[PDB]
Amino acid sequence: GVYTFENEFTSEIPPSRLFKAFVLDADNLIPKIAPQAIKQAEILEGNGGPGTIKKITFGEGSQYGYVKHRIDSIDEASYSYSYTLIEGDALTDTIEKISYETKLVACGSGSTIKSISHYHTKGNIEIKEEHVKVGKEKAHGLFKLIESYLKDHPDAYN
Secondary structure: OEEEEEEEEEEEOOOHHHHHHHOOOOOOOOOOOHOOOOOEEEEEEEEOOOEEEEEOOOOHHHHHOEEEEEEEEEEEOOOOOEEEEEOOOOOOOEEEEEEEEEEEEOOOEEEEEEEEEEEOOOOOOOOOHHHHHHHHHHHHHHHHHHHHHHHHOOOOOO
């Protein structure tokens, strides 16, 4: 009952930088470089692995106030990250849940990151493109900030 789409992007940054930069410090990396994209975010429980719950806070005087992001599992061995949006303007009012999984792999130019998008709709309801486009475009925008950061600051969490 979900639309899964596989996407990927190449980078000149080893999988090890992006890796720590998108799961360990991402919540210290995203706001640093991406003040325009995301306002801020901090973990409530865990460090960014399975059993971890993340809470993101958007602009005060904005449409979005608060949202709960739940993490599913990280395999540092593979540098994989899977999480799921439980509630918030993330699921509007007609959505059940939205899951996103991304794995970083080293490529001949650096590392090609594969980002999976899954929009789990309910009943006959359906997730629009413009909906996942704005949410994903932002999410991608953050990884965009961080990407630049490691190539300029690969010293993250190391």
